[PDB]
Design an enzyme around this catalytic site. Structure first.
Site, PDB file in Angstrom:
ATOM      1  NE  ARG B 104      -3.538   0.981   0.402  1.00  0.00           N
ATOM      2  CZ  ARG B 104      -4.754   1.228   0.869  1.00  0.00           C
ATOM      3  NH1 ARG B 104      -5.016   2.311   1.584  1.00  0.00           N
ATOM      4  NH2 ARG B 104      -5.735   0.371   0.604  1.00  0.00           N
ATOM      5  CG  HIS B 131      -7.891   0.816  -4.456  1.00  0.00           C
ATOM      6  ND1 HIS B 131      -8.661   1.663  -3.690  1.00  0.00           N
ATOM      7  CD2 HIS B 131      -7.574  -0.231  -3.659  1.00  0.00           C
ATOM      8  CE1 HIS B 131      -8.800   1.152  -2.480  1.00  0.00           C
ATOM      9  NE2 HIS B 131      -8.152   0.003  -2.436  1.00  0.00           N
ATOM     10  CD  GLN B 134     -12.897  -0.161  -2.262  1.00  0.00           C
ATOM     11  OE1 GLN B 134     -12.211   0.428  -1.431  1.00  0.00           O
ATOM     12  NE2 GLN B 134     -14.004  -0.823  -1.941  1.00  0.00           N
ATOM     13  CG  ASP B 228     -12.763   7.959  -3.329  1.00  0.00           C
ATOM     14  OD1 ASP B 228     -13.071   7.900  -2.120  1.00  0.00           O
ATOM     15  OD2 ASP B 228     -11.623   7.672  -3.747  1.00  0.00           O
ATOM     16  CB  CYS B 268     -13.806   3.173  -2.193  1.00  0.00           C
ATOM     17  SG  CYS B 268     -13.117   4.819  -2.484  1.00  0.00           S
ATOM     18  NE  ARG B 314     -11.090  -3.595  -0.215  1.00  0.00           N
ATOM     19  CZ  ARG B 314     -10.442  -2.477   0.074  1.00  0.00           C
ATOM     20  NH1 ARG B 314     -11.089  -1.371   0.403  1.00  0.00           N
ATOM     21  NH2 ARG B 314      -9.113  -2.468   0.032  1.00  0.00           N
TER      22      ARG B 314
END
Ligand SMILES: [Cl-]
Ligand SMILES: [Cl-]
Ligand SMILES: [Cl-]
Ligand SMILES: [Cl-]
Ligand SMILES: [Cl-]
Ligand SMILES: [Cl-]
Lengths: 327, 327, 327, 327, 327, 327
Positions: B104, B131, B134, B228, B268, B314
């Site tokens: 990350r 990403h 996600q 987002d 998200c 997730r």
């Protein structure tokens, strides 16, 4: 139970017989992990990991080794012991909760007090004076890459020798009877008190401890050449020690100076061998060393380099320490 | 073994067949966890978690998923890779200690180098460009809340579209043949190079990729509206992008503009939907947006919102990735 | 299932019957750990540990207790909830991933909101108002070092009484019918609202709650004397409160003032009892208290001190809380 | 843990999200039983089964479901609670011995008091007002025999509608948004208070609740036709209600009146479809209904009948309730 | 093996040493159940449960205790031994199929014949003369609610004393050396033969057996007051015994007459403490005792009442009996 | 798999080879239970036990046998099948919930319909016509007490021969080739249809079926004498059949009439051999048979009696049936 329920603070407190028992145990556990024969014998044991200094190799080696033997582990981030709570008080609380403590910090005084009051085995990830967990991994790597007995192996550590890495490299080689050579300016030799301890040990084991300022003489006839970063620490100190340690850089000509085509290269890591690190480029720009500080990129990436096999053996040696003291 | 021993850096490197296999696996593992049929198949496997950026959903999803399958996990706090040790050197040490690495951080360059030299599967928690973990959770959530096939689902992402969230949302929908719509100012569209890749993919799958600046046209006929945060980053940048993205706010009228009473809302996370966050009140005070920045509090807390069901998935999707690559 | 699936925010929400059930459970689990009879009954359960304030005793107690019962644990470092994501949003994500949450932070408002929206048991490691996990350990320690029933035990907390430690010490003793005495300046008494709640509770249980400013009267006839640090906080505040709390220092004469040769001493820790801590020497230099701030080094290290047995019981009491709520 | 540690008294106390979670869980457990993937997760848990009314489907469903998940069960025969010992007293004794209680009796008052004082989850096998365990099985059966979403399913219950079967059928369909139709004389409609509750629920979910006296209009366009016995009760009452409910008999012409060749038939059972039961022949003789009372033998044994698949789903739905509340 | 392979018919056949061994075992098993340390040691053992009289506490205690230790149990409903098959014949068949028998019936003759010919341990759930399983639970409850040794405990049973409850209460207290008081009319005292046995036992143990007709003298200085229903039996007999036992009702004034604010109240159950039972309202109407027959509703629901903690201990004491005789 | 997945309704449907396989299996399972070699092979299998008639030997044999092989069992009390629900409907519900059904009722029609529609193995505990589970136990007992082959064994059943006990005794002996003798008045002989079936079977196996009215001739040369109660039924019928069956009483002289000192006595039970049963004394008073009805107390309690060894073998034979059909 020679090593049962014992702290691991420095190899000075260990006999040669015990050290080679831990090297043998690391060999068998490494083989058991690959072969699938490994069986967990530390199930449900908790290990606290004090880390006042950052660490990648030592932290991970403790975590995975612990998990492979069924133990759990609590990683204490640097984010401050000795600020609000004394080391003596902390030791007496963790000793009643955890089966063992690891300590990665500053002074041998700190980890010795931890062992004194903890009541449980205490391990030294690294102090300013010693770094014994690394030494076990180093000797195991040399033995694996050596066709000859451990006491016949020769190696030269070159660079800042009065740091913890050079100190313990002197101890381990003297313990095991091997031919040890520390090469550095006399400014950066280990303290004469420690040198004299290892001279006495070498008398009883046949070890050949030699300290010299001349690189081409220190590498002649060695099987392994070893080096470490020249500063642990502010950036300004680099200028001073780069002047001292410039002739002690590890380049292709140095390995050739050994005269041994089989010679290998070792490094405890982290290492500055290129300009692909934030501080590494800062040194390369101001001081004009673009292709490595203490070792050339060529040497570091050459087939002679075994630094990554050395890094992996941290897992197996630390695992041996856990098994030998908690079982 | 199509996905066996494979890194997960972005969905571009994955076929539609493989992506839907991972969606199916996430469904079965989610059901197995509730029903009690789950059986651990990653016992004793260690997973390192590089986290140069802070994370709540991704870190926890990795930890719990790992523990549910019997694996252990080492969480590396941001408190600095690339400062003293290169990414290439770190990869070759963790690859000999850990069965897998998650990363990350910042650049796809960093995680691609990690995968190149690690020797073990490497996963992308989040980079600046993509990403993908996600995206798996998002499509699973849409499928669960959709009575129709995945390729018939329509959804519109609205907001900053050239960030990692909009980039991967374009990729996944193009892979799976669904009707994708990115809605944003042309300043904030994804780079034309990536758009052209997904146009080519959509040709082979029947996907309908459309990029527009007009919100009321992007939401017409969609099943899900996605948004987002508009900044990842200094506070000063908010003023610039709030002017650009003011008409792209997600309010009750926008969902009504879709014309679909069944339409749901996704995010998200983290999200600024009220003045109950430290930075959230800073935006609400200076820029006068008290009841939400990119989505109204009403919309975020409405029955149409499924952001928390999306967050839970997730765990199950990341778990599917672990099982499909390590088993 | 009186305590099944219940949050643990403060002992006010608990009956005396339930509190003594948790004390009994802590006793049996402590004995089961030593005797080897302990059998894990939380296998595969994940527990998130929010720690906005640093902690040694509480964090480790949760980790080891969890691992002893087969549970896993995720430690969230202070390095920021409420900055980018609200507490309400965080609760609804962790509640779908974790079987329980612990919270060590600032306000009872924060942990009460966590319990409201989490959907799973929430525990209070420490807030500004209460510290109930410590209270369970304290009463267990007193019971072990007492030949008499819990309701006949007498103890005096002396020092800053309006902090979380004094607040919960008032609650627990009132719940269990024991003779409680808080000794402090009236400036530092708990808020009258809370005092009045505990007076009402003491009526129904036979407890004897007394608040006084005179130390020699508060310790007469007590079995245990309790104290804590006078500041949680900037260094400058020490000067103000050292003037107020100077006569409330715990020295040998104070224990003698109880008139009980069997009297013991307790401290939740961390404690300033010597000049071997960074901030401890700062107080000793400016304010001239070299051999302890709130307790003498002699008293802290005397045979009457049981602070470390008290610290160990944090493991067993927290373990009881985990078992009683998750099983 | 939305459904963790919760009583199951009626579906009014459950959200649509929770109900569909239990339907999904029943599906996965049913599949796990056939496939062999089922793993017991209620080992050693004891469940008391109060049965003041006789039962075959509910008792066996509880016993086998319990045994499949490793739980034990104590069956309390009708042979008298409330005679020598109050329900409140009984609840407080069984709650300290058993992990859960099931109750099959007379009044919602009785089972609500049981839940109030038991301290453990309490389930409603059947009361005079509700029968929620049956409703879960019914919707699961409809979903299995339906190609369309649950909210698009239409069904008509016909017969005595103010009994517990019609009451809960109104609730469940309103919860899940489906098209519900109760068909009966206005004498036998559910109480207007309950009808109004379900009208309000249907507003928020899109359900279409309709109550009518005309059979041919209630079955038009439905996927399933449902019926139950017209008396729970003395024989003399049959004469009164047979006159009222004669036109509401379920025969071949009625299913044809739906206009749907795919239409199926359901019945919670026991059913009077022939003269092969002791009381069934008593009705057939005096009242002259030889080939069925509320449904023809032809319809009951036709390929359209799915009453036995419905009966089997009692095992899997009750099993889902046990797992969701005790795990 | 003092208690190994032994029947449990009455405590007369047991020494004080053995009785206190069973009390200790019940304590440890109760703690093991809560703490999770319990391990089944009766796996695959079958226990027949003869129940000629209905039972809630004893039946459930046997079932759950059995299941907790891995044993199975067969519950024989009253629906008739001695009608078609003799007790002697039944004993010799169940003794070859079952590892133990429990008997809840009428005469000590019946259960003594069962033990004589069964060949396996036989337990007495209740007879007309004795009720020893209850006595073990009662003493365990008193010990838990007593700060003093068992032989220093004082208690008074008041009511019908010549029934099985008063008979065994006399035996147990005499065995354990405690101060026992039976308070009743001389019409309802136990048979002089049994009184004389317990006087002799009390001589050897220090017990203080006293029988009196005056309530205020029997309760003075006692720790617990005990009572039971005045009829086991036709309704008509209530009128006769209500006249005799009216002054022996347990009300608030009676507990005050003890002079002990710590005094607690006990009842083997079922109890008539209100008008919420079918027969309870029949007594309240004809005989005008609305708020309790042998104990006030206030007393029964007061904090002094421990009847439900007493009921729960039936599980743990019966469990101790099973373990001590079958292991 | 000759007996795999087969119902057990009567031995007519079984070959001699299969019957002797079940006798051998009962022998091995009986020995495995004593020796500890028994291993459960029916884990998690549920068996419903319909009991419309009361039972002690058959119910317990099913329960314990089931539990010994790891199966569970649901006991359906007489307290009414065929009253509200048909046998056909009940069979199709229990067949989807249970792995097997046992039926103890009235007509072979009932259990044959149960087997027809259940879809799972159905066992006959007892019907009015047959009682095959008893027959397996009887032959096993004879074999154990016989030094000679099964086909050489001779036995005489005397009493009411047209009941289920005499019917199946004729079948089993004819199947196994042994010398069978039924002795009774011609009024109470089995129906000629069944006699003729067994005469045909005896032709193919060498069995010697003989029916006679003369007792002294039926017992000559037999190894075992068998008898059962003369009424299943109102008390008034006893007077009629006591006159018929008076000369067929089993007394010491009858066993002497066999001429075999090794002769043993058998009885399926329950038996009237004394005046220690409620109905047994009613017969003894009115009809003057104090020391036994169909067998003397002396004969029943003599060393020649093996009725209790016969009763125990019900467990092992029924266990063999469960294993042979479900495994
Ligand atoms: Cl070079
Ligand atoms: Cl809005
Ligand atoms: Cl002092
Ligand atoms: Cl028809
Ligand atoms: Cl009163
Ligand atoms: Cl005789």
């Amino acid at each position: 139970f020679n090593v049962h329920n014992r702290s691991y603070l420095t190899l000075i407190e260990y006999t040669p017989r015990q050290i080679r028992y831990l090297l043998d145990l690391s060999r068998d556990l490494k083989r058991a992990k690959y072969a699938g024969t490994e069986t967990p014998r530390l199930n449900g044991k908790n290990i606290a990991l004090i880390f006042e200094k950052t660490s990648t190799r030592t932290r991970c080696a403790f975590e995975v080794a612990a998990h492979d033997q069924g133990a759990h582990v609590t990683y204490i981030d640097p984010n401050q012991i000795g600020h609000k709570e004394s080391m003596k008080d902390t030791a007496r609380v963790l000793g009643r909760m955890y089966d063992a403590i690891e300590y990665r910090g500053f002074g041998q005084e700190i980890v010795e007090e931890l062992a004194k009051y903890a009541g449980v085995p205490v391990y030294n990830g690294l102090t300013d004076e010693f770094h014994p967990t690394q030494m076990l991994a180093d000797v195991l790597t040399m033995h694996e890459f050596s066709d000859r007995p451990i006491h016949d192996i020769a190696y030269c550590y070159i660079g800042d020798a009065h740091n913890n890495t050079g100190n313990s490299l002197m101890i381990v080689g003297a313990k095991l009877g091997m031919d040890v050579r520390l090469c550095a300016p006399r400014c950066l030799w280990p303290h004469d008190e420690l040198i004299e301890q290892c001279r006495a040990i070498a008398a009883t084991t046949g070890a050949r401890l030699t300290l010299t300022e001349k690189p081409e003489e220190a590498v002649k006839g060695v099987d392994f050449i070893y080096t470490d970063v020249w500063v642990s620490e502010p950036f300004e100190k680099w200028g001073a020690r780069i002047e001292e340690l410039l002739p002690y850089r590890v380049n292709a000509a140095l390995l050739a100076a050994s005269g041994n085509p089989r010679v290998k290269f070792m490094h405890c890591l982290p290492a500055f061998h290129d300009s692909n690190t934030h501080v590494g480029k800062q040194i390369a720009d101001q001081y004009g060393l673009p292709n490595g500080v203490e070792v050339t990129d060529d040497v570091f990436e050459s087939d002679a380099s075994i630094v990554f096999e050395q890094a992996e053996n941290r897992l197996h040696t630390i695992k041996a320490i856990l098994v030998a003291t908690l079982t």
